[PDB]
Design a protein around this ligand. Structure first.
Ligand SMILES: CCCC(=O)Nc1n[nH]c2cc(-c3ccc(O)cc3)c(-c3ccccc3)cc12
Length: 285
């Protein structure tokens, strides 16, 4: 677009490249996403235009939608750091628990809002979690999933992996749970490098799901009665040194059955959020 100048490449998103851009009329700094051809579908235009009205302080603001000369451009608010880089810069000492807790609470607020409007993230990950100097964390890449680097499977819910074509809101809760454990331990919970490896890593840690813990699991599209039977591991061995309230909350976000899995609304009422404060991060720019 004529009104923008590329300053640098922010990264490579799911639907094309993302650039740091300066506006000419405003002088504002923005995140510009060049989307993906035939002539661009109408259905995708409406789904994207619905996202402009889906505003919350914990959702990266879609400033403008630009469709010009059979190419789509998504203009987003710019944030200085992503959670993947922040976790990398906090590897030596680890993100302090008060800050981990505030980030989780705000992300849950973000999720509770999307889920109230029947909007799923589908691909929550540190990469698409953005942070500012004020202590705010925001959800990015939202609603894009509905409308050749390797895609991370680490945060994928088991029902998606088991072939469920109709994801519920619970997939976002599973993804956020994995991020939470990772923020605590400074290591990915389930670093799978293939769908079966990803699934098998979940099975080794939380036990192989059977009809007992997940009614209707054996009838799922990709479920094989031939899967190995692993016994569950206690959460104290999974996430040390997260306290009992954190472990109990994480456990509820990581429930196999999406119906038994905690909502973003009920999670905000969990005793873990009794002593929630808003610390500011120490970020280097
Ligand atoms: C050093 C720059 C740190 C950074 O990534 N900043 C970003 N500011 N704003 C941003 C907005 C987005 C974004 C991309 C697609 C969407 O549909 C929504 C948002 C991204 C972003 C880029 C790649 C993958 C995921 C998110 C990064 C930033």
């Amino acid at each position: 677009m004529e009104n923008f100048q590329k300053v640098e490449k922010i990264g490579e998103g799911t639907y094309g490249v993302v650039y740091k851009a300066r506006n000419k009329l405003t002088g504002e700094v923005v995140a510009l996403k060049k989307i993906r051809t035939e002539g661009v579908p109408s259905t995708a235009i409406r789904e994207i235009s619905l996202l402009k009205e889906l505003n919350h302080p914990n959702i990266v603001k879609l400033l403008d939608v630009i469709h010009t000369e059979n190419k789509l451009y998504l203009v987003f608010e710019f944030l200085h750091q992503d959670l993947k880089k922040f976790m990398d810069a906090s590897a030596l000492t680890g993100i302090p628990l008060p800050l981990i807790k505030s980030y989780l609470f705000q992300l849950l607020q973000g999720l509770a809002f999307c889920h109230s409007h029947r909007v799923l993230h589908r691909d929550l990950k540190p990469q698409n979690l953005l942070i500012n100097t004020e202590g705010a964390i925001k959800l990015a890449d939202f609603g894009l999933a509905r409308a050749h680097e390797v895609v991370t499977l680490w945060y994928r819910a088991p029902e998606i992996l088991l072939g469920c074509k109709y994801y519920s809101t619970a997939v976002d809760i599973w993804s956020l749970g994995c991020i939470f454990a990772e923020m605590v331990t400074r290591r990915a919970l389930f670093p799978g490098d293939s769908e079966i490896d990803q699934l098998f890593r979940i099975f080794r840690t939380l036990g192989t799901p059977d009809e007992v813990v997940w009614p209707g699991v054996t009838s799922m599209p990709d479920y094989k009665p031939s899967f190995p039977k692993w016994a569950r591991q206690d959460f104290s061995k999974v996430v040390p040194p997260l306290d009992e309230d954190g472990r109990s909350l994480l456990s509820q976000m990581l429930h196999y059955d999406p119906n038994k899995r905690i909502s973003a609304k009920a999670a905000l009422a969990h005793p873990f959020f009794q002593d929630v404060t808003k610390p500011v991060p120490h970020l280097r720019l």
